Design a binder for this molecule. Structure first.
Ligand SMILES: *C(=C)C1=C(C)[C@@H](Cc2[nH]c(/C=C3N=C(/C=C4\NC(=O)[C@H](C)[C@H]4[C@@H](*)C)C(C)=C\3CCC(=O)O)c(CCC(=O)O)c2C)NC1=O
Ligand SMILES: *[C@@H](C)[C@H]1/C(=C/C2=NC(=C\c3[nH]c(C[C@H]4NC(=O)C(C=C)=C4C)c(C)c3CCC(=O)O)/C(CCC(=O)O)=C2C)NC(=O)[C@@H]1C
Ligand SMILES: *[C@H](C)[C@H]1/C(=C/C2=NC(=C\c3[nH]c(C[C@H]4NC(=O)C(C=C)=C4C)c(C)c3CCC(=O)O)/C(CCC(=O)O)=C2C)NC(=O)[C@@H]1C
Ligand SMILES: *[C@H](C)[C@H]1/C(=C/C2=NC(=C\c3[nH]c(C[C@H]4NC(=O)C(C=C)=C4C)c(C)c3CCC(=O)O)/C(CCC(=O)O)=C2C)NC(=O)[C@@H]1C
Ligand SMILES: *[C@H](C)[C@H]1/C(=C/C2=NC(=C\c3[nH]c(C[C@H]4NC(=O)C(C=C)=C4C)c(C)c3CCC(=O)O)/C(CCC(=O)O)=C2C)NC(=O)[C@@H]1C
Ligand SMILES: *[C@H](C)[C@H]1/C(=C/C2=NC(=C\c3[nH]c(C[C@H]4NC(=O)C(C=C)=C4C)c(C)c3CCC(=O)O)/C(CCC(=O)O)=C2C)NC(=O)[C@@H]1C
Ligand SMILES: *[C@H](C)[C@H]1/C(=C/C2=NC(=C\c3[nH]c(C[C@H]4NC(=O)C(C=C)=C4C)c(C)c3CCC(=O)O)/C(CCC(=O)O)=C2C)NC(=O)[C@@H]1C
Ligand SMILES: *[C@H](C)[C@H]1/C(=C/C2=NC(=C\c3[nH]c(C[C@H]4NC(=O)C(C=C)=C4C)c(C)c3CCC(=O)O)/C(CCC(=O)O)=C2C)NC(=O)[C@@H]1C
Ligand SMILES: *[C@H](C)[C@H]1/C(=C/C2=NC(=C\c3[nH]c(C[C@H]4NC(=O)C(C=C)=C4C)c(C)c3CCC(=O)O)/C(CCC(=O)O)=C2C)NC(=O)[C@@H]1C
Ligand SMILES: *[C@H](C)[C@H]1/C(=C/C2=NC(=C\c3[nH]c(C[C@H]4NC(=O)C(C=C)=C4C)c(C)c3CCC(=O)O)/C(CCC(=O)O)=C2C)NC(=O)[C@@H]1C
Ligand SMILES: *[C@H](C)[C@H]1/C(=C/C2=NC(=C\c3[nH]c(C[C@H]4NC(=O)C(C=C)=C4C)c(C)c3CCC(=O)O)/C(CCC(=O)O)=C2C)NC(=O)[C@@H]1C
Ligand SMILES: *[C@H](C)[C@H]1/C(=C/C2=NC(=C\c3[nH]c(C[C@H]4NC(=O)C(C=C)=C4C)c(C)c3CCC(=O)O)/C(CCC(=O)O)=C2C)NC(=O)[C@@H]1C
Ligand SMILES: C=CC1=C(C)[C@@H](Cc2[nH]c(/C=C3N=C(/C=C4\NC(=O)[C@H](C)[C@H]4CC)C(C)=C\3CCC(=O)O)c(CCC(=O)O)c2C)NC1=O
Ligand SMILES: C=CC1=C(C)[C@@H](Cc2[nH]c(/C=C3N=C(/C=C4\NC(=O)[C@H](C)[C@H]4CC)C(C)=C\3CCC(=O)O)c(CCC(=O)O)c2C)NC1=O
Lengths: 177, 372, 164, 177, 177, 177, 164
C-alpha cells in the first residue's frame, strides 16, 4: 500500500505542503542506498526455505512441549501449518524491507493475526521465540555474518538496514503479544 | 469433465441451453463506491495466470483453508478442468462448494446457522439478512447441500456481480440495498491472516443477522475497512476497543451479556441478604428418568437464568391484557384492604409425628374451570 | 474422524434427512468386522515395542548411508528421534484398527507429509522401507488370525500409497 | 401461637404463618381433643372446592330466578363472585373451628355483611338457603357420612365438633337474616 | 450422595451432579419412600414452565393493577423479572421435596428475601397469592387430580408427599410476609 | 464427528497410549448391543412425524399463550418454523443415538442455539416443555411402552439405551436454558 | 439410486479418493441382510394382487365420503384408477427391498408428492389409511420370517412419514 516514497507524501498531505528541497535530500539518501537495500532483500529470499525451517526447528529444540501430545505442534498437519505460518512472516517482512516501511505487512499480515492465534490455541510465547530466531538470522545475512554461508558483496556499511529489518520483526512480535 | 465449452450446467433456467460463455469478463458495478478505489483490483480468468487464480479462490471461497498438497484432491479434479477450459470459474466454485473439502471444514464442523453465513461470505462476499437466511435454511432442511449451493451460483446476484469469468471478492458498490448490508458485509469479511476454522462458533454475526435490529458494533466495522480510510482513528483511540473485540471475537465470548439480552439488574446493595452475587439467581436444575435400573437423577445447579424478556412479552402483556370492568361494586367499607379473604387453614398432612400445620390469609378468587 | 459411521451420518445430513434403512444397514457390517480387527489391535498394543525395535533398524540396514555426517541422521539422539518418529505411525494404525475406517491416519499422519518431509530433508523412501518390512512379515499361524492379517496389512499399504 | 394466628387474620393485608412440630405439640396440649380438631378442619378444606360448587349450584336448582336475565347470578362476573363469597364464608368458619371461638368470625367477617348485601342487591333469603346446604354438607364430612368421598380416619367420635360447626353456620345465617 | 447434591445447590466448585445406576437405589434406600419421592419431583419439574406462567397470570387476573401504569408488572423488564422469580421459588422447592429437608430452602432461598422485596418495592399482598397458587398447583399434580393432564403412575397414596410441599410452600409464605 | 469408537482414541491420544485390552472389552461391550442399538434408532424414525406433531401441539394445549396474537407461535409461518424447529432436534438426537455419543449434535445443532433463540425471541421456558415431551416419548418407544402403537421386537433389556437418549435430550435443554 | 453402495461410492468420489477400508466394510453388511429382505420381496411379488384387493378397499371403508359425487372418487373407473394408483407404491416397496436402501422410493414415489396431490385434490390421509392398513397386519407365523417383517414395516412407515 504505502512505500517509502509514498510515506512522506501523506506526511505532507496533512500539512498541504509541496514536498521540496528540505526533505527530498532525506529521500535522495534512500536512493543512495538503493542498491544496498536491493542486495539485502535478495539475501533474505536466497536461502528462504532454510531460513524458516531452521527457525521453527530451533523453536522446537528449545521447547519440546509442542511435540508432546496436547501441544500445538504435535500432529503432522500442524507442523505443516507451522512451517507455513512462519513462512508468511518471512514473506511479508521481505515485502516491507523492499518497500522501506512497515505498511504492507501491518494490514495484510498483522491485521487479524492476534485473534486467529487466540481462537486456535496457538501459544503466543512460543511464536515470540519463533520469530525472534528470524530476527537474529535476517541480521546475520545482511551483515554477512552467517557462519555456514558467506556471500560475496561490494564491501561497505549495511547496519542501517540491520536495524530496519529488526524493527519489522518486533512489529510482528508486538501485534501477537 | 463435460465439454471444452460449457457456460452453464444443470439446466435450471431454460435460457442457458442457448446461452454462450461470456467472451470477456463482466464490468464493475456502475455506482461510485468510494471504498473500492483503495481496494486491490479484482482477479478474473482472462487477466491472470493459474498461480494467483488458485490463491484467490483459496483466499475467498476457501476462506483461509490451508489446503495441503495431499489434501483436497477433489479441488485438484475441479482445477484441472478449469485450466483446460472445461468449465468456467463460475462453475468451478460450484464444483468447489459441492466438493467434500468445502464440506469437511465448513459444513460438519461449523453450526447449521453458521454454514449459511459462511456461504454468503465465500460465494457472494457479503452477509445475508434474516429473510435470506430463512429461505436458505429450508434448503438445508428439505433439499440438502447441493441445492443450497445452487441458490448462490444460479442466482442473479452472482451473475451480475461476477458473471462467468470473475473470481469472487468483496464488492464495494457504494449505494447498497440497505445501510446494514454494507457494514454487515464488511464485518463478515476481515482482511488477511484470518480464517474461518478456529471459530467453530462465529456467534457475533449469528446474532446481528438473527434479529433484524441490533446492527453490529462500530469497532467491528472500523477494523477491516481499508487504509487512508481508518487512520488517525486507530493509533490508540479505538485501538484498545479493537484489541478487545479481538480477545472476545477470538475464543467466541457469547454475546448474551452486552449485545442482545439487555436486562437492567438491580444494584448489589439492594438485596444483600440473598447475597454472594456469583450466586444470586441459581436454581436446582433437576432431571429424572425413572426407566428400568439405569434411570439416573442429575441434580445440577443451573446458571444465572435471566428473565427472557419475550416470554414475559408474549404473556403478562400481550397475553392476559384483560383486567376489565374493575369497579367491583364498592358497597360498605367495613373491609380494610382485604375485601374477601378466606383464612385458608391448609393442613400440612399429619404424618403422625414431626409434621405440623401453619396457616396464611390470602384473597381468594374462583378459577375459570369452576362453576358451570 | 472419517469412520464408516461419520461417512453415513454426514451423508444423511448433507441430504438433510433421517437415518434411512441403508444407513442402519451399514452399521450391521461392523458386528461382523470388529470381532477380527479389535484382536489385531491388542496384538499390536501387546507387541508394539518389538515391532519398532527390530523393524525400525531395517530402514538403517537398507539405507546405511544416512548415519553419515551432514545428513538426516547425524548423532545418536536423532536416531532416538527416529524411533519416536515411527512409533507414532504404529500408534496410528492401531488407532485405525479400533475405529474401523482410515479416519485417524489421514489428518494426523498423512495430511501435510509432503510439506514437512521436503523442508526438513527427511527421505520418504526410508520411511516406507521400514513400513513395508513390517508388511511382508505377516503370517497366519504366529501373529494373529487369518482374517486380521488381511486388514492389518490393508492399513499399512495405505500408508505406503499415501507417502509415495 | 394463637395470638400469632391472630396476627395472621386481623392485619388487613396478606400474611401467612406456619407452626413447626416443636411448637405443634404445645398447640395440641393447649386446645382440647386437638387431633380430632386438626382432622376437623382438614376434612372440610380438602373438599371445600366441591362444597361451594355444589351448594351454590343447589341454590340455583331450588331458585332458578338467579339465572334469569337481570338476575343476580346471570353473568359470569356475578357467578364467579358468588363462589368468591361462598369460599370466604367457608374459610372463616374453618378458622373459627380451628381456634375454637367465634370472635374472629364476627369481627373480621360478619361485622358489616348486612350493611353490604342490601347495598349490593344480594338476595339474603337465597344466600341463607346457600349456607344451609353448606351446613348440611359439612356435617356429612365431619361424620364421614358423605356418599361419594369417604376419607380414612383414626376412629372414634367427633359429634361434639359436628354441633360446633352447626353453631358456626347459623351464626352466619343469623348475621344475614 | 446427598452431600454431593447439597454442595452443588449452594454453588460450590462443581458444575453439576450426576447420580448413577447403583447410586440411585443407594439414594432410594437413604431417604424414606424413595420410589414415590422421585415420582413427585418428576411431576413438578415436567410442568414447571406451565405452572409459573399460570401463577403469574393468576396473580394478574386477581389484582389487575400490576399491569396498569404504576404497577409492578408493567414495563416488561419487570414482568420478565417476575416470571423469573416464580421459577426460582419452584426450582428450590422441588429440590427440598427431593432432599426431604427444608434446610437448603431456608439458608439459600429465604433469608433476606423479606428484606429484598421491601428494598425492591415488591408488594407482599400479591406475592403471597403467587405462592398460594403454586401451592395448589403442586398439590394437584402430586395426587394426580389435575384437571387437564392425567399422568400415568403406579397406583397408591401420595398424600404424605402432598402435605410435605404444603409445608414447604408455607415456609415461602412465612419468609415473604 | 466422534462416534463411540473414536471417543476412546482421543482420550488415548492425549496420553499417547495404544488402545489395549483394558478398555477394548468396554468397546466390545458396545458392539454386543449392536442390534439392540440398531432396532432402537429404527423405532425412533418409524414414528418421527407423529412424534413432533404430538409434541408441539401438546406444548400448545398446555400453554395457549403463543396462539394469541403477539405470541411467538401465532402466525402460519412461525408454526411452520416451529414444526421444523423441533424436527431438527429429533433429527440430530437420532444421529447421537446412532453414533453413541453426544458429539455430532453438540457442535452443529446446539452450538449457538442459545443466542439464536434469544435474538429471534423464542420463549425458552416453552422450549424446555417442547423437548421434554420429546424426551418422554423417546423412552416410550425404545422400551415399547407406547400404548397406541406397539411394535414387535426380540425380547430383552433395552434400558441402557433409554438412559442414553434421556441424557441427550436434557443436554439440548441445558444448552437452551 | 440412493443405495448403501451409492452412498459410500459418491462420498468417496466427492472427497476425490479411493475406496478405503471404511467403504469396503459397508458392503460386508449386505452379506448379512440380503438373506432377510430378498425373501420378503418374493413374498411381496407372490402376493401383490392380494395386498391391493383386500387392503386397497380399506381406505374406502374408512373414507366412504370419497365416493360422493364432486369428489376424487366419482365413477367406477377412478376407483379402478385408484387400485393402480396404490399398486405403484407396492411395486416401489418391492423396488427398495431388493436395493437395500430408500433409493427407488424417493425420486419415483416421494419427490413431488406435495405438488400433484394438492393440485388435483387428492387427500393424502386416504393414501396413508391404505398403506398403514397393510402395516399393522404383519405377523411372524403366517407372513414371512421374523426379521423380514421388521424391514418391510421399516419401508412402509417411511412412506407414511413422507406423505404426512
Ligand atoms: C385469572 C382470571 C385466572 C387464571 C390465570 C387461572 C389461574 C389458576 N390456575 C389454578 C389451578 C391449577 N393450575 C394448574 C396448572 C396447570 N394445569 C394444567 O393442566 C397445565 C399442565 C398447567 C399449566 C396451565 C393445575 C394443575 C391447577 C389445579 C387444578 C386445575 O387444573 O385447576 C388456580 C387455582 C389455585 C387455587 O385454587 O389456589 C388459579 C387461580 N385461574 C384464574 O381464575
Ligand atoms: C361436591 C360434588 C362434593 C359433595 C357435596 C355434598 N353435597 C351434599 C348434599 C346436597 N347437595 C345438594 C345440591 C344438589 N342437589 C340437587 O338437587 C341439585 C340440583 C338442583 C344439586 C346441585 C343438596 C340440595 C344437598 C342436600 C343438602 C341440603 O339440602 O341442604 C352432601 C351430603 C350428602 C348427603 O346428604 O348424604 C355432600 C357431601 N359431595 C361430594 O362428595 C363432593 C366432595
Ligand atoms: C548490504 C546489506 C550488503 C552490501 C550492499 C552493497 N551493495 C553495493 C553495491 C551494489 N549492489 C547491487 C545489488 C542489486 N543490484 C542488482 O542489479 C540486483 C539484482 C537484480 C541486486 C540484488 C549492485 C548492482 C551494486 C553496484 C552499484 C555501484 O557500485 O555502482 C555496495 C557498494 C555501495 C553502493 O553502491 O551502495 C554495498 C555496501 N554489501 C555488504 O557488505 C552487505 C552485506
Ligand atoms: C497421460 C497418461 C496422458 C496425458 C494426460 C494429460 N491430461 C492432461 C489434462 C487434462 N486431463 C483431463 C482428464 C482428467 N481430468 C479430470 O478431471 C478427469 C475426470 C473427472 C479426467 C479423466 C482434463 C479434464 C484435463 C484438462 C485440465 C488440465 O489441463 O489440467 C494434460 C495436460 C495437457 C497440456 O497442457 O500439455 C496431459 C499431458 N497426455 C498424454 O500424453 C498421456 C497419453
Ligand atoms: C418450536 C418448537 C419453538 C419455536 C420455534 C421457532 N424457531 C424459529 C426459527 C429458527 N430456529 C432455528 C433453530 C433450528 N433451525 C435449524 O435450521 C437448526 C440447525 C441447523 C436448528 C436448531 C433457526 C436457525 C431459526 C432461524 C431460521 C428461521 O427463522 O427459519 C422460529 C421463527 C421466528 C419468527 O420469525 O417468528 C420459531 C417460531 N418457537 C417457539 O415458540 C417454540 C417453543
Ligand atoms: C405419587 C407421587 C404418585 C405415585 C407414586 C408411586 N410410584 C410408585 C413406584 C415407582 N415409581 C418409580 C419411578 C421413580 N423411581 C425412580 O427410580 C425414578 C427415576 C429414575 C422415578 C421417577 C419406579 C421405578 C417405581 C417402582 C415400580 C414402577 O416401576 O412403577 C408407587 C408404588 C410403590 C409404593 O407404593 O411406594 C407409587 C404409589 N403413584 C400415584 O398414584 C401417585 C400419583
Ligand atoms: C353468592 C352465593 C351470592 C352473591 C354474591 C355476590 N357477592 C358480590 C360482591 C361482594 N361480596 C362481598 C362480601 C364478601 N367479600 C369479602 O371480602 C368478604 C369477607 C371479608 C365477604 C363476605 C363484597 C365485599 C363484594 C363487593 C366486592 C367485589 O366483589 O368486588 C357480587 C357481585 C355484585 C356485582 O358485581 O354487582 C355477587 C353476585 N349474590 C348472589 O346472588 C348469591 C346469593
Ligand atoms: C510369519 C511371517 C512366519 C514367521 C516369521 C518369523 N519371525 C521370526 C521372529 C520374530 N518375528 C518378529 C515379529 C513378529 N512379532 C510381532 O509382534 C509381530 C506383529 C504383530 C510380528 C511379525 C519378532 C519381534 C521376532 C524375534 C523373536 C520373537 O519375538 O518372536 C522367526 C524366527 C527367525 C527370525 O528371528 O527371523 C521366523 C521364522 N514365523 C513363522 O512361523 C511364519 C512362517
Ligand atoms: C372426627 C372429626 C373424625 C376423627 C377424628 C380423630 N382423629 C384422631 C387422631 C389423629 N388425627 C391425626 C391427624 C391430625 N392430627 C395432627 O396433629 C395433624 C397435623 C399435623 C392432623 C391432620 C393424627 C396424627 C391422630 C393420631 C393418630 C394416632 O397416632 O394413632 C382420633 C383419635 C383420638 C385423638 O387422637 O384425638 C379421632 C377420634 N376420627 C374419625 O373417625 C372421625 C371421622
Ligand atoms: C414476581 C412474581 C414478583 C416480583 C418480582 C420482581 N423481582 C425483581 C428482582 C429480583 N428478585 C429477586 C429474588 C429472586 N432472585 C433470586 O436469586 C432468588 C433466590 C435466591 C429470588 C427469590 C432478586 C435477587 C432481584 C434483583 C436482582 C435482579 O433482578 O437482577 C423485579 C425487578 C425490580 C425492578 O426492576 O423494579 C421484579 C418485578 N414483583 C412482583 O410484582 C411479583 C410479586
Ligand atoms: C431395544 C431398544 C429393543 C430390542 C432390541 C433387541 N434386538 C435384538 C435382536 C436383533 N435386532 C435386529 C434389528 C436390526 N437388524 C436389522 O437387520 C435391521 C434393519 C436393517 C435392524 C434395525 C436383528 C437382526 C436382531 C437379531 C440378532 C440375533 O438374534 O442374532 C434383541 C435380542 C438380543 C440381541 O441380539 O441383541 C433385543 C433385545 N428389543 C426390545 O424388546 C427393545 C424394544
Ligand atoms: C398376523 C398379523 C396374524 C394373522 C392375521 C390374519 N390375516 C388373515 C387374512 C388375510 N391376511 C392377509 C394379508 C397377508 N397376505 C399377504 O400376502 C401379506 C403380506 C405380503 C399378508 C400380511 C390377506 C390378504 C387375507 C385375506 C385372506 C387370505 O388370503 O388369507 C386372517 C383370517 C381372517 C381374516 O380374513 O381377517 C387372520 C387371522 N394371522 C395370523 O396367523 C397372525 C396371528
Ligand atoms: C312490562 C313491565 C315490566 C316488568 C314487570 C318487569 C319484569 C322484570 N323484572 C326483571 C328483573 C329483576 N326483578 C328483580 C326483582 C325481584 N327479585 C327479587 O329477588 C325480589 C324478591 C323481587 C322484587 C320484589 C330483580 C332483583 C331483578 C334483576 C335486576 C335487574 O335486572 O337489573 C326483569 C329482567 C330485566 C333484565 O334482564 O335486565 C324483567 C323483564 N320489567 C318490565 O319492563
Ligand atoms: C392438551 C393436549 C394434549 C396432547 C396433544 C397430548 C400431548 C402429549 N402426549 C404425551 C405422551 C405420549 N405421546 C406419545 C406419542 C404418540 N403416541 C403414539 O402412539 C403415537 C405414535 C404418537 C402420537 C401420534 C407417547 C408414546 C406418549 C407416552 C404415553 C403413551 O404411551 O401414550 C404427553 C406427556 C409428555 C410427558 O409425559 O412428558 C403430552 C403432553 N397430551 C395432551 O394432554
Amino acid at each position: 500500500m504505502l512505500d517509502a516514497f509514498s510515506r512522506v507524501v501523506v506526511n505532507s498531505d496533512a500539512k498541504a505542503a509541496y514536498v521540496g528541497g528540505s526533505d527530498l535530500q532525506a529521500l535522495k539518501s534512500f536512493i543512495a542506498d538503493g542498491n544496498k537495500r536491493l542486495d539485502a532483500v535478495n539475501s533474505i529470499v536466497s536461502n528462504a526455505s532454510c531460513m524458516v525451517s531452521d527457525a521453527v526447528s530451533g523453536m522446537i529444540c528449545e521447547n519440546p512441549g509442542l511435540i508432546s501430545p496436547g501441544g500445538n505442534c504435535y500432529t503432522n498437519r500442524r507442523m505443516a501449518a507451522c512451517l507455513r505460518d512462519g513462512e508468511i512472516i518471512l514473506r511479508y517482512v521481505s515485502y516491507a524491507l523492499l518497500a522501506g516501511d512497515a505498511s504492507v505487512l501491518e494490514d495484510r499480515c498483522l491485521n487479524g493475526l492476534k485473534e486467529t492465534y487466540i481462537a486456535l490455541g496457538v501459544p503466543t510465547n512460543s511464536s515470540i521465540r519463533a520469530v525472534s530466531i528470524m530476527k537474529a538470522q535476517a541480521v546475520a545475512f545482511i551483515t554477512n555474518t552467517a557462519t555456514e554461508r558467506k556471500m560475496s558483496f561490494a564491501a561497505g556499511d549495511c547496519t542501517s538496514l540491520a536495524s530496519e529489518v529488526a524493527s519489522y520483526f518486533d512489529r510482528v512480535g508486538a501485534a501477537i503479544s | 469433465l463435460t465439454l471444452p465449452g460449457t457456460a452453464e450446467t444443470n439446466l435450471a433456467v431454460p435460457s442457458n441451453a442457448v446461452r454462450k460463455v461470456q467472451p470477456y469478463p463482466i464490468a464493475k458495478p456502475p455506482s461510485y463506491s468510494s471504498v473500492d478505489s483503495l481496494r486491490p483490483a479484482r482477479v478474473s480468468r482472462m487477466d491472470a495466470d493459474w498461480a494467483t487464480i488458485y490463491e484467490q479462490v483459496r483466499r475467498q471461497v476457501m476462506g483461509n483453508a490451508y489446503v495441503m498438497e495431499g489434501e483436497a484432491p477433489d479441488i485438484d479434479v475441479a482445477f484441472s478442468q478449469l485450466k483446460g477450459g472445461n468449465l468456467t470459474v463460475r462453475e468451478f466454485v460450484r464444483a468447489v462448494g459441492k466438493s467434500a473439502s468445502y464440506r469437511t471444514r465448513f459444513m460438519e464442523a461449523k453450526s447449521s446457522y453458521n454454514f449459511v453465513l459462511l456461504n454468503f461470505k465465500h460465494f457472494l462476499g457479503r452477509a445475508p439478512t434474516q429473510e435470506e437466511v430463512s429461505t436458505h435454511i429450508q434448503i438445508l432442511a428439505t433439499s440438502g447441500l447441493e441445492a443450497e449451493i445452487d441458490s448462490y451460483i444460479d442466482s442473479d446476484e452472482y451473475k451480475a456481480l461476477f458473471g462467468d469469468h470473475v473470481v469472487p471478492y468483496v464488492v464495494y458498490r457504494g449505494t447498497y440495498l440497505s445501510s446494514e448490508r454494507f457494514n454487515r458485509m464488511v464485518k463478515a469479511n476481515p482482511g488477511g491472516a484470518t480464517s474461518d476454522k478456529a471459530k467453530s462458533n462465529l456467534n457475533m454475526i449469528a446474532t446481528v443477522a438473527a434479529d433484524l435490529p441490533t446492527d453490529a458494533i462500530d469497532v467491528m466495522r472500523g477494523l477491516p475497512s481499508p487504509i487512508t480510510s481508518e487512520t488517525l482513528a486507530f493509533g490508540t483511540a479505538y485501538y484498545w476497543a479493537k484489541v478487545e473485540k479481538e480477545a472476545s471475537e477470538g475464543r467466541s465470548a457469547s454475546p448474551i451479556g452486552e449485545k442482545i439480552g439487555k436486562f437492567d439488574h438491580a444494584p448489589i446493595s439492594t438485596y444483600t441478604s440473598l447475597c454472594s452475587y456469583d450466586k444470586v439467581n441459581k436454581a436446582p436444575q433437576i432431571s429424572v428418568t425413572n426407566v428400568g435400573s439405569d434411570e439416573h437423577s442429575y441434580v445440577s445447579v443451573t446458571s444465572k437464568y435471566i428473565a427472557p424478556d419475550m416470554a414475559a412479552a408474549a404473556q403478562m402483556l400481550a397475553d392476559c391484557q384483560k383486567y376489565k370492568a374493575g369497579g367491583n361494586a364498592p358497597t360498605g367499607k367495613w373491609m380494610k384492604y382485604y375485601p374477601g379473604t378466606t383464612v385458608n387453614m391448609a393442613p400440612y398432612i399429619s404424618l403422625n409425628d414431626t409434621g405440623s400445620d401453619s396457616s396464611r390469609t390470602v384473597s381468594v378468587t374462583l378459577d375459570k374451570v369452576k362453576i358451570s | 474422524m472419517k469412520s464408516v459411521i461419520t461417512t453415513v451420518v454426514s451423508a444423511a445430513d448433507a441430504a438433510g434427512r433421517f437415518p434411512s434403512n441403508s444407513d442402519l444397514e451399514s452399521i450391521q457390517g461392523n458386528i461382523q468386522r470388529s470381532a477380527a480387527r479389535l484382536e489385531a489391535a491388542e496384538k499390536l498394543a501387546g507387541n508394539h515395542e518389538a515391532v519398532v525395535k527390530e523393524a525400525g533398524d531395517a530402514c538403517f540396514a537398507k539405507y546405511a548411508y544416512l548415519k553419515n555426517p551432514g545428513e538426516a541422521g547425524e548423532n545418536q539422539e536423532k536416531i532416538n528421534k527416529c524411533y519416536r518418529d515411527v512409533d507414532h505411525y504404529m500408534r496410528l494404525v492401531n488407532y485405525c484398527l479400533v475405529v474401523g475406517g482410515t479416519g485417524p491416519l489421514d489428518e494426523w499422519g498423512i495430511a501435510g507429509a509432503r510439506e514437512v518431509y521436503r523442508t526438513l530433508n527427511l527421505p520418504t523412501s526410508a520411511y516406507v522401507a521400514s513400513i513395508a518390512y513390517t508388511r511382508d512379515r505377516l503370517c497366519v499361524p504366529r501373529d494373529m488370525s487369518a482374517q486380521a492379517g488381511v486388514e492389518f496389512s490393508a492399513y499399512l499399504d495405505y500408508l505406503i500409497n499415501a507417502l509415495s
